[PDB]
Short mmCIF file of C-alpha atoms in Angstrom, two decimals:
data_model
loop_
_atom_site.label_atom_id
_atom_site.label_comp_id
_atom_site.label_asym_id
_atom_site.label_seq_id
_atom_site.Cartn_x
_atom_site.Cartn_y
_atom_site.Cartn_z
CA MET A 336 30.88 -109.62 -6.45
CA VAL A 337 31.49 -112.23 -9.37
CA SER A 338 34.87 -111.94 -11.02
CA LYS A 339 35.58 -111.94 -14.79
CA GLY A 340 37.40 -115.27 -14.42
CA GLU A 341 34.52 -116.88 -12.67
CA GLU A 342 32.07 -115.40 -15.05
CA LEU A 343 33.81 -117.22 -17.97
CA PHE A 344 32.73 -120.63 -16.45
CA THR A 345 29.11 -120.19 -15.46
CA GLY A 346 27.87 -122.45 -18.18
CA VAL A 347 29.25 -125.29 -20.41
CA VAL A 348 32.32 -124.41 -22.27
CA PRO A 349 33.94 -126.03 -25.22
CA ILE A 350 37.46 -127.54 -24.73
CA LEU A 351 40.29 -128.03 -27.34
CA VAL A 352 43.38 -130.10 -26.22
CA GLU A 353 46.41 -130.18 -28.27
CA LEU A 354 49.60 -132.30 -27.44
CA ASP A 355 52.91 -132.63 -29.16
CA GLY A 356 55.00 -135.33 -27.62
CA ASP A 357 58.35 -136.89 -27.93
CA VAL A 358 59.23 -139.87 -25.58
CA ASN A 359 62.63 -141.45 -26.12
CA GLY A 360 62.51 -140.06 -29.67
CA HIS A 361 59.07 -141.56 -30.35
CA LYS A 362 57.08 -138.51 -31.70
CA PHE A 363 53.42 -138.23 -31.53
CA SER A 364 50.55 -135.79 -31.50
CA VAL A 365 47.06 -135.99 -29.83
CA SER A 366 44.10 -133.80 -30.22
CA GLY A 367 41.07 -133.73 -27.89
CA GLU A 368 37.66 -132.09 -27.76
CA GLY A 369 34.79 -131.91 -25.40
CA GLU A 370 33.18 -129.77 -22.78
CA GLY A 371 33.67 -128.63 -19.27
CA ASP A 372 30.98 -127.63 -16.67
CA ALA A 373 32.74 -126.05 -13.73
CA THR A 374 29.55 -125.79 -11.73
CA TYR A 375 29.70 -129.73 -11.60
CA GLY A 376 33.46 -129.95 -11.82
CA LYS A 377 32.68 -132.23 -14.91
CA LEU A 378 35.01 -132.89 -17.88
CA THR A 379 34.00 -134.90 -20.80
CA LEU A 380 36.74 -135.32 -23.39
CA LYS A 381 37.78 -137.52 -26.33
CA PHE A 382 41.43 -137.80 -27.50
CA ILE A 383 42.76 -139.03 -30.78
CA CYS A 384 46.38 -139.95 -31.46
CA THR A 385 46.56 -138.22 -34.83
CA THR A 386 50.03 -139.62 -35.81
CA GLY A 387 49.07 -143.30 -35.45
CA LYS A 388 49.64 -145.67 -32.62
CA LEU A 389 50.20 -143.84 -29.32
CA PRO A 390 53.64 -144.99 -28.13
CA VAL A 391 52.95 -144.65 -24.47
CA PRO A 392 49.77 -146.01 -22.54
CA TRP A 393 46.80 -143.76 -22.49
CA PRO A 394 46.45 -143.70 -18.73
CA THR A 395 49.91 -142.05 -18.27
CA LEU A 396 48.58 -138.91 -20.14
CA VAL A 397 45.30 -138.48 -18.11
CA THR A 398 46.87 -135.95 -15.74
CA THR A 399 48.37 -133.95 -18.48
CA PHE A 400 45.10 -133.69 -20.54
CA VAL A 401 42.20 -127.70 -17.35
CA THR A 402 41.88 -127.37 -13.52
CA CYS A 403 40.01 -124.13 -14.24
CA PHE A 404 36.98 -126.59 -14.53
CA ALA A 405 37.20 -127.78 -10.93
CA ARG A 406 34.12 -127.12 -8.81
CA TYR A 407 35.18 -124.64 -6.09
CA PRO A 408 32.10 -124.31 -3.81
CA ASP A 409 31.02 -120.87 -2.85
CA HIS A 410 32.78 -120.81 0.44
CA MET A 411 36.13 -121.39 -1.51
CA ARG A 412 35.53 -118.86 -4.26
CA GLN A 413 38.38 -116.66 -2.98
CA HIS A 414 40.85 -119.63 -3.38
CA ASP A 415 40.26 -120.54 -7.15
CA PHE A 416 43.52 -119.59 -8.63
CA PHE A 417 42.72 -121.27 -12.01
CA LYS A 418 39.80 -119.17 -12.96
CA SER A 419 41.21 -116.08 -11.62
CA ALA A 420 44.03 -116.28 -14.15
CA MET A 421 41.53 -116.35 -17.07
CA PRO A 422 41.13 -115.35 -19.92
CA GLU A 423 44.84 -114.72 -20.31
CA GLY A 424 45.36 -117.98 -18.76
CA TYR A 425 48.11 -119.89 -16.95
CA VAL A 426 51.09 -122.22 -17.60
CA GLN A 427 51.03 -125.68 -15.97
CA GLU A 428 54.51 -127.30 -15.77
CA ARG A 429 55.09 -130.76 -14.44
CA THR A 430 57.80 -133.49 -14.15
CA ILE A 431 56.37 -136.91 -13.77
CA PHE A 432 58.81 -139.46 -12.59
CA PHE A 433 57.90 -143.01 -13.44
CA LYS A 434 59.49 -145.26 -10.65
CA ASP A 435 62.24 -147.49 -12.03
CA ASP A 436 61.59 -145.88 -15.60
CA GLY A 437 61.80 -142.58 -17.38
CA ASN A 438 60.12 -139.05 -16.69
CA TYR A 439 57.84 -136.88 -18.66
CA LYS A 440 58.29 -133.08 -18.52
CA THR A 441 55.10 -131.24 -19.59
CA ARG A 442 54.43 -127.57 -20.25
CA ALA A 443 50.86 -126.58 -20.91
CA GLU A 444 49.20 -123.33 -21.69
CA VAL A 445 45.74 -123.10 -20.66
CA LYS A 446 43.77 -120.12 -21.89
CA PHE A 447 40.73 -119.08 -23.78
CA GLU A 448 40.57 -118.55 -27.51
CA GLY A 449 37.32 -116.93 -28.01
CA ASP A 450 34.72 -119.13 -26.24
CA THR A 451 36.97 -122.36 -26.40
CA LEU A 452 39.12 -123.17 -23.45
CA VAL A 453 42.38 -124.39 -24.97
CA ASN A 454 44.95 -126.76 -23.35
CA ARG A 455 48.09 -126.69 -25.42
CA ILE A 456 50.79 -129.03 -24.39
CA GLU A 457 54.33 -129.98 -25.10
CA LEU A 458 55.48 -133.20 -23.63
CA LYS A 459 59.06 -134.52 -23.43
CA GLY A 460 59.94 -137.91 -22.13
CA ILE A 461 63.44 -139.36 -21.63
CA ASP A 462 65.29 -142.28 -19.96
CA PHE A 463 62.50 -144.77 -20.59
CA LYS A 464 63.00 -148.42 -20.89
CA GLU A 465 62.07 -149.48 -24.37
CA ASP A 466 60.73 -152.71 -22.98
CA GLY A 467 59.38 -151.37 -19.74
CA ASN A 468 55.81 -150.66 -18.56
CA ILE A 469 55.55 -147.41 -20.46
CA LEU A 470 57.09 -148.17 -23.92
CA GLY A 471 56.17 -151.68 -23.67
CA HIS A 472 52.40 -151.12 -23.05
CA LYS A 473 52.02 -152.95 -19.82
CA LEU A 474 49.60 -150.82 -18.00
CA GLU A 475 45.89 -151.42 -17.70
CA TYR A 476 43.17 -149.08 -19.16
CA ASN A 477 41.82 -148.01 -15.95
CA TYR A 478 42.31 -145.21 -13.36
CA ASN A 479 42.14 -144.52 -9.51
CA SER A 480 40.46 -141.67 -7.68
CA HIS A 481 42.81 -139.29 -5.86
CA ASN A 482 43.09 -136.18 -3.63
CA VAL A 483 45.69 -133.67 -4.76
CA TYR A 484 46.77 -130.99 -2.25
CA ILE A 485 47.22 -127.59 -3.52
CA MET A 486 49.59 -124.95 -2.01
CA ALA A 487 50.32 -121.40 -2.90
CA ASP A 488 53.52 -120.45 -4.38
CA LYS A 489 53.47 -116.84 -3.51
CA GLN A 490 56.92 -116.01 -4.63
CA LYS A 491 55.86 -117.46 -8.02
CA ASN A 492 52.53 -115.81 -8.09
CA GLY A 493 50.93 -119.18 -8.49
CA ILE A 494 50.30 -122.69 -7.08
CA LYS A 495 52.27 -125.83 -6.57
CA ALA A 496 51.37 -129.46 -5.82
CA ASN A 497 52.93 -132.97 -5.60
CA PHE A 498 50.98 -136.18 -5.81
CA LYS A 499 51.26 -139.88 -6.66
CA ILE A 500 49.40 -141.61 -9.48
CA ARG A 501 49.49 -145.43 -9.20
CA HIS A 502 49.02 -147.07 -12.73
CA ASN A 503 48.10 -150.81 -12.63
CA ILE A 504 50.46 -153.15 -14.28
CA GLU A 505 49.08 -156.02 -16.20
CA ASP A 506 50.47 -158.33 -13.58
CA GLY A 507 48.67 -156.88 -10.66
CA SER A 508 51.47 -154.65 -9.52
CA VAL A 509 51.85 -150.85 -9.59
CA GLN A 510 53.74 -148.42 -11.73
CA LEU A 511 54.14 -145.24 -9.60
CA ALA A 512 54.13 -141.93 -11.44
CA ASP A 513 55.25 -139.12 -8.96
CA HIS A 514 53.95 -135.84 -10.14
CA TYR A 515 55.57 -132.43 -9.37
CA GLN A 516 53.70 -129.36 -10.51
CA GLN A 517 53.86 -125.64 -10.77
CA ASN A 518 51.25 -123.21 -12.20
CA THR A 519 51.95 -119.56 -13.08
CA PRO A 520 49.92 -116.92 -14.76
CA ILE A 521 50.47 -115.91 -18.28
CA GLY A 522 49.38 -112.29 -17.90
CA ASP A 523 50.43 -109.55 -15.56
CA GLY A 524 47.17 -109.15 -13.78
CA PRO A 525 46.19 -110.03 -10.23
CA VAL A 526 45.23 -113.53 -9.38
CA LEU A 527 43.94 -115.35 -6.43
CA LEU A 528 46.51 -117.21 -4.30
CA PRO A 529 44.78 -119.97 -2.22
CA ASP A 530 45.08 -121.32 1.29
CA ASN A 531 46.11 -124.93 1.37
CA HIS A 532 43.24 -127.14 0.16
CA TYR A 533 42.69 -130.22 -1.88
CA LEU A 534 41.14 -131.20 -5.33
CA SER A 535 39.28 -134.54 -5.27
CA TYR A 536 39.56 -136.23 -8.82
CA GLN A 537 37.74 -139.25 -10.24
CA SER A 538 38.44 -140.51 -13.74
CA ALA A 539 36.80 -142.95 -15.99
CA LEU A 540 38.35 -144.18 -19.22
CA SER A 541 36.54 -145.71 -22.14
CA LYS A 542 36.39 -146.35 -25.78
CA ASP A 543 34.09 -145.19 -28.62
CA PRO A 544 32.97 -148.43 -30.32
CA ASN A 545 32.75 -146.51 -33.79
CA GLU A 546 36.38 -145.16 -33.59
CA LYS A 547 39.11 -146.82 -35.44
CA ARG A 548 41.84 -144.38 -34.59
CA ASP A 549 43.90 -144.90 -31.35
CA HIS A 550 41.90 -142.96 -28.90
CA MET A 551 40.62 -142.42 -25.36
CA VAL A 552 37.24 -141.18 -23.91
CA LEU A 553 37.60 -139.60 -20.60
CA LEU A 554 34.99 -138.68 -17.93
CA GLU A 555 36.66 -136.61 -15.12
CA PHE A 556 35.20 -134.89 -12.05
CA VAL A 557 37.28 -132.45 -10.03
CA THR A 558 35.94 -130.89 -6.84
CA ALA A 559 37.75 -128.55 -4.39
CA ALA A 560 37.57 -129.18 -0.59
CA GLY A 561 38.90 -127.44 2.48
#
């Protein structure tokens, strides 16, 4: 049998992303739009900084900017927490520790508003170096592929993960961003709590040649594996 959650993702779904951020008192907002195709694990999104210049590097926001679009193959269908929480949705919380620099704390509500999948995010960053790799914009506009290990958090009726992103610094070095994550349902209904597994990510960053606002184009694929 196919569940309500699963059924919401059988075709291409429009996505809206909204982020309000404050990093060391530098306030900013980002909107994003695009589409998700969970059958392929495919996200196509374009983000605009609506407040002017983004005060942090675009790559540092990629993980923050809808795991319900992951491709869970049929044999893993009983392990897809993210879709099982829909349409009421889930809250994704992270702390992202930038090594030798500050940290982001993020809280995102991921839920349907009609036929649109919304990712609504608040991001708070503190303890950054005003001349470091983040506030000083010293990170390259590129991205690595990663596997992220997902575990059930049965007590919390959700999932957790921790993983490392390694941003490339312009001098050839690496800026580590250590991610700690917890997701919990918004509603009171049943969800699927998964066996341990991983999600395989690839992300490609580009620019729209006709866009004069500060922006990022993201093509990302997310696939579950045992």
